[PDB]
Structure formats: C-alpha cells, structure tokens
C-alpha cells in the first residue's frame, strides 16, 4: 500500500540474524503491564531496513535474550523505539541492557516535526489526533495494522476489539497471536522513523532533533533512578489532606449558601446562578459561558478559572485537593510505590498543562509539578514525604526569576540598556528596574494603582490593552466587533508611557508576529520550530517564544547539573524553576560546583542558580 518495503512478503519470520549489517533497526517490547520495577518483559519484536521482522516470546524461547545481548554488545548503529523511555526501562528491569546513547524515539521526533498533532484549530475535522504510533504511522506513512488481530483477541478475552482494551491481555494470549500483533508494531515504527528522516532532512530540523536526542539519556536515567519516599509519613499526610478537604468543602458550601454535590452538573449550574437570555449564558458574576455539545452552559475548569467568583476558586481548590489526597498520595505514592520509592514518568515534550508546542517537560504518577506553590500549607503537608538518597542530604535550588530573564534577553536585542543593567547588577529585578524608570511601584499597594510587575507580565503573555487595564483595576469596558475588553483612557496612557521608557518590548512582539504570519513559523536559538498555521494565534508569537526559549535552557540545566554532580550526587527532580539534588554530607563543595556549572552569561542577561536550603527531606530544605 505504497511503502518502501512489503512486509507481508518478507517479514514476520526473522530469526537470530546478524544485526550489525544495519545502520538502524526497530525495537519494541511487550510487557505484563505498565508499572516499572514491577511488570516484566515477556517478549519483544524487531524490524530491519530490508524487510525482515520477528517476534520472540522470551518465556517460551529464552535463547533469544542470549542472541539479543550478543547482537547488541558490538552494535554501533541506531536503535529505534516509539517510547524509548518505556522500552529501555522495562528491558532494564528484565535484564536486557541496551546501549542507551544509541536509542532513538519516534514520538520525540514527531514532536519536533509538528507540535500540533492534537491542537484543535477552528478548521479541524474529527477527533483530536495525538502522538500514538497508530496515528502517526497512518498520517505520515499511510499504513495501519489489520483489524483481524484485535477481533481474534476480543474473541479470546472479551472486551472491545481495540488496542486500548486488549493490551492488558497480551501476556495471556498464545505467542503466535502476539506475533501477529507485535511484528507490524516494529514495522510501522521503522517505517515512521524512515519517513521522519526525509521530513527532518527536507525541513532543516537537524538542530532541534539533535538537541532532544542529547537530552534523552539524562531524562531516562533520572526516570529509571526514581525518587525515595517516606511511606510512614505519607499515610499521615493522607489524614492531613482529610482535614484540608473538609475545610475546602465548608468554604465552598459557604460561598454557595447551601450544601451541594460538585459532581452534579445540575447543582453546579444552580450554585453559580447560570441563567440564559437572548441566546447567552451568564453565571452570577457576569461571566459569559460557552455551551456544551449537549447544549448546557459549560462550567468546566477552563470556565471556572475565567470567573472572578470566589466560589469558582473554591470548587477548583476542592477538586485539586481531592486529586492530591486520592490520586497523588494514596495511589501514586502509597499504593504504586516500589521498595520505598516512586518512579514517575517524565514526558520530555509535553508540559505541565498538556500542551506540546513548547519545549516543556512534565511528570506523571505522581505529578510532582502539581504540588502547589502559592499554598504553602499543602506543600508543607506533602513535601516531607520525599527523601534524599540514603546517607545524603536534600539540596534545593532555584533558577531565580527565570522566565523574566528570558524576556529581558529577547528584548535586550532591541535595547542595550537591559543588557547593561543586568551587567552591573546580575541580581537585578526587572520589575523593580522598570518601576524605577516610569516612577511607579513594583507592586500594587492600592486598587487601580499601576505597577511594573503587571505591566511586564502583560507583555510577556501578549495581552491586549483592556486585558492589561483589567489586571490593573483601571477603567475598561466590553465592546462588539465579536466581544473584547476595550481599555480606558487612563490605561492606554500608561501602556503608551511604558513603550516610551522601555524601548524594544513592542519590537519583540511585532517582529515575532510578523515572521509568524509571513514565513509561517519562528524558532528558538536552539532551533525549536514554533508553527502558526494560517497565522492562527500569531499575536501570541513572542510570548510562546519565551516559554520555548526558557524550556530550552531548562533542558540545558539538567544536562549541566547531571554532569556537575557526577559521583558526588544525583538530581532528584525539577519542578517549575526549582532543582532538587541528593548530595553528600559535605555539601558546600558539591553545591559550588553545580552553581558555577549552571550559572552562565551566554545569553544577553545572566542565568543565576540561587541556593534554597538543605535538609533531611524536601520540606526541610525549603524551610517549611
């Protein structure tokens, strides 16, 4: 069906062939489940660039691990998996040592090539699209697994005849069936990797593709190491969250005037006062609600966040703390822990919000980035559950004012004063440095008082003049066009005065949006391509550049820390702009090496790593 190889003629029967005769080959594991350090590999499959492919049940045929180890020890070429982290770790636990610097990831390559596989544009047709192998193979090589195996599986086990339903069953099926399932997987993976070479070659993505490949071993190593936990405390924390939830509930019933079930869509419509008029749905705080497909007024999380109603923040707070007690604590740290540690997965390309279009990484199971930062009470309940390595101390540090320095550096191209200001005072606070020039304060003391922080943050998130006015408490009002926030007379004066005292901020926004509209994309200095199909949301161009450049330099941090610790320690984790490390008891020499290895002046403004504290666990290092 228009493919390089014809796998049905040549494949599915490969044996202990010689793999050194290839520059690339495919690899795919089948495991008893998904839990690292618990489930084990039960078989695997490999495809070769000359039409061969094979599957081996390691239980029935243990001669194939010996051949594998033999093939892999001299092998100098590229190994391809779709999920390099999963395949390499499940193998490692099962005693299959692959050379990690030689593994490649079809899904990370897919993100470098188009970050919007799941983005819903105003013109899309169907369901989302994603980074699964089935979907990327269909879209890029036009290939697809035959549905006959899923039917055979369902006839054996029961459920829907789908990959999602039948994967948990594969180690229970006869190996000739898993051979029909697993061989095309390695075939489609190698054909995907082959077609990505062309697209990466034709589109000049060699730099960002190489960068993420350089990053990958440092995250799989970290992923495989895990974080040590204190489970005896963790059970105590679930009793503390109990009280925190009971309070969240009381505060929420108070704001509604009654008790109710936040899980009943009807009662949540009642407490927020959702009324319809002339085709429009409003909630009691005046917010205009969109409709659900079912025609109901939509009160999802995106809508709650857009309200000023305190009841919205209360609902979201209660949902969040329930998820922290039940999913974060009970399930991921207490239940699924293994020998006193937890092993979350690190998504190298998907950020904390599920967005793919920025270099951001993010944890799952437990989601360590989802411990709050503006509620020190919750962090103080959770963070004592996380421990350094046995014998070591917990060192916490912070990239100070990270995303603002990235901003300063991009606009520093069009303003040498910003570069010189940070040169004299490397610890300069950009907000205070702008307030000190406009004659306005860094922060608000009174409502309606203009401040530098809110100004600076409205340039960072490309924000219209009314959005800026609103964040300041300055007069504004709604207007048709269809609906938008029109800035008042007093707000357009400070925004204009802002762009006169701070030259270059407007040039950042405009050149970024322009190039996004002409050429179709812009790029970080590491070469991450940020794409704006049909100029969609192109006015956001400069802000997204900041998130991406700051995510580039964050992956640059892991590389530099992991190297600087060496044998003296290990990076525990990274949340937001913070970096935790397990270090030896003589910690000051180790810390000063990490600090000089990370702190750099290779951008237009310095990057600083500021010490945060040391302790016997995560909370104590932070001072809680």
Residue numbers in the entry: -1 to 479, 487 to 629
Task: Recite the paper's sentences.
Here, we present the crystallographic structure of the apo form of DpoZ of vibriophage ϕVC8, composed of the 3′-5′ exonuclease and polymerase domains. Through extensive screening and optimization, we could eventually obtain single crystals that diffracted to 2.8 Å. The two molecules contained in the asymmetric unit of the DpoZ crystal represent different conformations. The transition between the two forms of the molecule involves mainly two subdomains moving mostly as rigid-bodies: the thumb subdomain known to hold the nascent double-stranded DNA and an extension in the exonuclease domain, present in a reduced form in only a few other PolA structures (see below). Thus, the two DpoZ conformations are hereafter referred to as the ‘thumb-exo’ open and ‘thumb-exo’ closed states. Their RMSD is 2.0 Å for the whole chain, 1.8 Å for the polymerase domain and 1.4 Å for the exonuclease module. Importantly, modelling of the dsDNA substrate in the polymerase domain of DpoZ indicates that the thumb subdomain in its closed state prevents the correct binding of the nucleic acid substrate. The three insertions conserved in the ϕVC8-like DpoZ subfamily take the form of external loops of several to about twenty residues, scattered around the polymerase domain's active site. Indeed, modelling a leaving nucleotide in the exo catalytic site in the thumb-exo open conformation showed that residues R161 and M165 of the helix E2 could contact the nucleobase. Interestingly, although their side-chains are unstructured in the absence of this leaving nucleotide, in the closed state these residues are much closer to the core of the exonuclease domain, assuming a particular conformation which blocks the active site from accepting a nucleotide.
